[model samples]
Target: GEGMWVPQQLPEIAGPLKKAGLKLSPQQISDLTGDPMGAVVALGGCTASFVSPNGLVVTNHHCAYGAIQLNSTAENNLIKNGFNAPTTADEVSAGPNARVFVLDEITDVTKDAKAAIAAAGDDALARTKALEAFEKKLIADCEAEAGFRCRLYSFSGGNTYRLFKNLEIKDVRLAYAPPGSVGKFGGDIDNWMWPRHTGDFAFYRAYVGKDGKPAAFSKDNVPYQPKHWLKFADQPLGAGDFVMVAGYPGSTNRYALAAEFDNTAQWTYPTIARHYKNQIAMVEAAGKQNADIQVKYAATMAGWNNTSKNYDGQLEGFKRIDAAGQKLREEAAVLGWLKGQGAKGQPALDAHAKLLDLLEQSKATRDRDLTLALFNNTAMLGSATQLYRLSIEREKPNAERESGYQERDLPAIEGGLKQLERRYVAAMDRQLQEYWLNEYIKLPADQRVAAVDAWLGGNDAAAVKRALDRLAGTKLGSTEERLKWFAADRKAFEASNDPAIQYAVAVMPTLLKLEQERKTRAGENLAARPVYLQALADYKKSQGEFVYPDANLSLRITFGNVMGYAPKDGMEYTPFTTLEGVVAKETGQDPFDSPKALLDAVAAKRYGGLEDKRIGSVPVNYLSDLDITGGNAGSPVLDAHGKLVGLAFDGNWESVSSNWVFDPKMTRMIAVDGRYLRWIMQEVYPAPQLLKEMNVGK
Candidate 1:
């Protein structure tokens, strides 16, 4: 299933409910439409929700990790000990930048976008550029009214487009987080596995100036007092209870062609997986035996490990699903069906042929392209390239600039550069660039970028070492250098002699050529793919199926019953996991370990009202058959009555391929039950003030 992009209007939800397998009356579905649904929010990288009128944003502990690392030092160890700000005054800034966005509305502009842009040009780049200008105009007009941020995003493989209006709150603060022992219990070992015991929750408070306008952090700023926040569910979940997740899900490609699937399965995922593994190894080597280094990379370690595990699952899942073969079979059948659709099918057939032909050509250079791309992931080089590109973009008019380099995005750009110190370590970043560059140079001469080849001196190890060392020695790593370069004109960048800046300048020509090549290829795909997708949509609809577009980091809703499944015969994967499982799994190890307080309290049966009477301990995590993806992390899992029950954090391992294919019988989403969060607060960690603020104990 592609999941759903839920319509905000009340009536539309009732019909959508049928597609989600919900049996609720129209009024009940309508009840979930407006204000109740409004509680859901986006945290840019993950989903979150307001738990109180005071802008108490709730998300997964992993989601708030960057901020935790931002506020920590060797002496504080916030990730290890956790944090609870007792009063509003005690709340600290959430890193370089944190934002909570409330979606105002989404309007379809497919017809207008297509007519003004696509219909005017046959060349891929020209049409893509035209589309960009059109999007810029629409955004400028939408943001003109002032209270919100706006953007145009495509759906259904560019077959349709919509305008999203958002109210962005820039100032955010860390409210509370549990020790990693609780929040990240089982760590990478249990991340995607079910029967999860991890708490996986955190709290942040959004802030605004006294005038109720979004503002920078200030001593006088107050809570956002949002228009909507989740209401706690008094009724606990039972097996197969109706449930839904409303939040931004990142990307998915269920409509991808067979060639695309094969390339990813056979090459792309494996390559990235190895890169993450080696990079993580380098980080581990640097971190261990030094508490200072360990603390510095704790959040980075978490992200790397998580992604490493995810890629592993995706690679395995592809083999298990016979992804390439299956896609070919489906494509063959679809092609046969389309051939009989008369004149209408010719357009889609032509598009599919063009798309697949281009994909075949991509395989020729996939290895070299991916390897070269990996070197760019280094913090210093990435930042340098960004700054250099930004300066170049500044040479153009604001509206004509590339999307990310546009005037509206400057705050975020500056913030990203300013925040680099907390995440970047010279040794760690150096190792990252070293290995990728080492692999990159091994490729055939024709496959290599001439500039990179010249810099490395025909696979010379010593030159590579000195090059990386120069990166380590550069002043651009400092906050002063970053801020200075942030406003520098292209002329200034060209005049600069900073080592990293020099590398960026030397590499820009080659890199820009590479980017244009990518754009041309992507433009080709974008131009042709929609025709095929529209045909697929119609074919599915003819079979009484509702075709939802692939995810693109937009607010959407998916409803399903709370249930579990068996991936293999005679082996049932249970839906719920409770505190008892945690006790059973503990080995006093880093991941399996929990706080002594929590273990002691649970042993004494300290969970009072929070306990599930049937199980005799608090429920920890549960599984639902709801659709979710990367950005669905921290999304509030709500009961049919529109009350908060849990938060979605991970999907079952079998469902790792859900982005491309969903197996309703096997795919399951894992969430931390609200009861466990409540119990942890009351009996274990003892954040009484936070409890009181959220009306937790009443």
Candidate 2:
């Protein structure tokens, strides 16, 4: 019998099992599946998983590139050449900065933190001291009996605190990765689009001391015994079966204010996309100018190009979702509720308009230049901007300066500047600076130029370079230097001759004033937080049990019936793609070019079982509907019976907007079946030992 439509009558399932039978709602199914709360094993902006008891972890190949690059040089292009560990001994240790966060626990501690801070009043030092004391107390209390490593992340101005107990794995090593041709096969063009057949998986192993404690890599260190590991089941999952994903999804807009959404939809996202596209084009053109530039900026170029491609796809997807239309509907609901309460919603409405205008203005001047500057020139404009901002702030009395650059921002600024000297690239820096000066800065209306000129004294490229040079050399290498520079340079600043210095001198006061005003408004809005809290309640009321909110680099679980869909007008994509599609698609080229081993497997018709069921000596295609997004890659797509069916890899082209809105009709998560993964692991690689470690029943 087909699975019951449990989503409609979730609570009903609890009563009278004989009459109603045990039915599983999508949420229940998600809860029952391995990743109940969407446990995402994350490390530095990347998602991974513990797949075996022996600490074998699975993640995307792209996620491991930084470590690979860090350990590689021009002589060894680990970026091009992949790493594979035949045995435990062969695994190479990653850098000290590498870490894995296992979410052990989470609890809300907002009320206490907020109350404590509020009592501390407007004294900045007292407020900060109180907040730190509250945080330490919370952490100590949370960690007391548990003895687990934990941290507290406060949000909504300390109105909420989530205590995350994490198992930090310091020792991780590269285990196995297919060559770039297989892992990143289609490259950027196929990225964020579908019809993809890339093998995107990589394996890593975590090591710990004999006592099961986290430890650094050493000969004595062994594979850590994980508390939970994903089991492999080769059974095929078909349409209508329950499928779900568990991973650390990066970000979402779940709790965003209507104003924030309006700004994003109306100005920010589109501007970002446009600016990225232009920047990519410029970088690609510059890359063609010299081989050295190409080599120097290859990683930067790749990063920009990937973002550009993703933004383009995401923007199109967002447009199709008609995010603006939804925002309008949501806004009307919000305004109506406010009016019904005999209160004006005009402030919120006006706030939305003002924010949008600010976004638009900021984008018009900063977006294009910032994007191009980040890519082409790392030093001149970038350094000059930071220094210019600092110089202006320094002119103000210590008590009157902006909060960010003055107090809260100094540590970050110092760290960034210190790191800059080591990582700075001259050519790229020059290129970016030149582009910003020649293209972006010059294009702005005289009013904008006057604003910039007011900060810099004049808007000349050479003058900007001179300011940047002085800023870099200032003993301002640390917080002390910054404080000293501000103190000693007060007289120099008052009598500055440089146009850039004059401009900085002129604009600093207004910028700081505006900053303070903005902060004050934000603080007032925070005090009125019940408005947002009510909005969240409304969203929960409206979107009850339809789908889960995205994780936002937090953990979240999503479950759906496995099914296929007709994406385009005439094209019906099947739930599964066969070995035949692979062979048919192979072009004898770099990425599309099939490996000799896979070709040999197909040619031999080496069907271990069900050899009689093969059509033209090739495997058949299948389909299933599973909700997924970028972070869902490497997620195990399980069948209704709680067995691994496939590895979720990508989504179809029509479904790229699934990030913003899940379209059950058109969106489908693509996965390589467990059967296929087994076939490759067993027949292609013949890693029977690793297979034994995975414990997949044959």
Candidate 3:
């Protein structure tokens, strides 16, 4: 249950799967391109699954929040009221950048990738550059087939590498989503808590050209015909029922050093949480005054709200588990074991020391790095610098350009710029700038960037105000102007009088330098991490323990059961929350407000045949003792027969720290019950057309 087992590892874990009540063959699960596994897809940031043959996909409502916001307006707020495309033709574009990456193949390129690094010799910077060049060329060749997106994934700190090839469905559409009142019931208050009643699910459709190939958004495109799609589970899921989730979980620090853990716990989480809270307060106040700002910044605010809340939860969890003390003890045990190994352990010991040195080096500039990065990343300024940088990169040969500035990345860049209008307000952007600038001025002199100091020209409140005023005159705020510059030359950007452009030009040198310095540190890590992690893995094997690499936004499978936990003495949480719980939590207020139809449906005890006699009503959401993290947000939860039962959305508050250390006792995955999904479509906020398409119509 602790391991995020890759597909290849399924064969090895077959016995455990069988023990856990898996009805399907281990080989069936191992076949990533067949049946149930093939239905799973990645949304770049979240996991989803194809639910119908015509590329109907299901994922968390939060995952599709951006698309909902994109198609919404002041007069027609899809985010508030929800959206249901009556027909395929009526479905709106999710966004230009929206993608559904259906994985086609995964090839192990460990030897070739490592050889590429080894050829770079002992120079750390050269090693980093060599690996980058190798990845680019490898991906370029793989993507030559067209309609496919290729990526290189490094695992166990480069001990292993795999090239992932996915059929890139470019034209994704918003098919259906429930109202915010339902999708985000209990809102941030219920985000990481359990005993939850949230319907955090949404639907999308992937489209391709008439010729059945990936293409830009066009009216001519048809629904993509996926090779496989998930069927809803026939059996009712009950307590202790086997449930498995396949997803692209983002990251985990389970193998991180004790110092690394301390750094994140003491410095990273706390610092960022404080900043996010302040930013949230600023946005909340600003949003009240402007509806556009409120709508545009809704997604941004939600992210900040989630993260800040998550950080607070992790901090509290860390205390409950004595996480820091545990880390120290574990590290001591590992080092002690290594010492006992004598000559054989010397190399790993050296690698550990080197990694700690790199951590310390990074710690010195942590504050400066965070402040400057956020300052440069403010809406207008980020766009300006990116444009200018693109122009500069264009001067280089395609192969020589930085990764994101490459020819392959242009469509996404344009998409981001195009989408900016709906998500940005100059006034709100200005407030963000002022906020970051205020933080900047507080940085110690030694930690300050010379380029930033020179640009600011002073170090006071008045200076920040003057600089803000100067930046406000920039024309890059307009999407048209930004797109125009997207094709402009380096000379044009250099000669531009726009304050934003000028500022980007001034900071380019320093930015590039900082990037190189970080790359050098990364290269050092690449050299050291594999050695130490390999040793750790070996040590674990020797101890008769199973070892899995940390999560790296790759396809992984985690299986457990539909069981709840006892959070405290004499307080046990049940696995399921029923429709009545939704009404019970209602207060006719935001976050708690159930729609009139929903309230009435509950009042009438309209189970609508989706009810479980065991619980006596439709299940709204359910808790399961399974492993999950951020990127697993919308993963389809499959029952023992590999049928969709729900969508994994959240983890209990105690589970947040499991990203760093596994806590089987408290870790639980929260999923919206598949029955609830069908009930909503069949009853309240109905979408019978979609249900019929999925072959689950009443």
- Which candidate should be chosen as best, given lDDT against the real structure? 3
Query: TM-score per candidate, in order?
Result: 0.92, 0.75, 0.95
Model 2 residue 450 distance off true place after TM-score fit, in angstroms: 9.0
**Clashes per candidate (backbone, < 3 Å):** 0, 24, 0
Superpose all Cα atoms of candidate 1 onto the true structure and report the RMSD in Å to 1 decimal: 2.9
Winning model by TM-score = 3
Alpha-carbon RMSD, each predicted model: 2.9, 7.0, 2.1
Cα deviation of 397 in candidate 3 (Å)? 0.6
Q: Which residues of candidate 2, in runs, are more than 4 Å off?
A: 1-40, 67-82, 114-160, 254-259, 337-424, 438-455, 460-525, 528-530, 539-550, 607-630
Ranking by lDDT: 3, 1, 2
Tens-place lDDT digits, model 3, residues 630-649: 79989999999999999999
- Residue lDDT tens for model 1, 1-698: 33755443334446656654454454543333256677888888899999998889899999998788789988999999998898888888995468888877878899998887656467777777778789999999899875579978898778778898888888899999999889999987886787789999999999988988888788888999878888778888867788888878888889888878877777777777777788788778888876666777777877777777777887778778777778999888788889989997999999999998888777778777787766776788888889999999999999899989999999879878877877887767777788877888678766778887776665767877877876776787788889898989988888887878888898999888877877777778787888889999888878777677788887777778878787778888777887878899989988988999888987887776787776656889988888898889999988876788999998889878887788777788899998888888888887888778778773
lDDT of 3 at 53: 98
The lDDT per prediction is: 0.82, 0.56, 0.92
- For model 2, residues 642-680, the per-residue Cα lDDT tens digits are 455555566677655555555667766666566665565
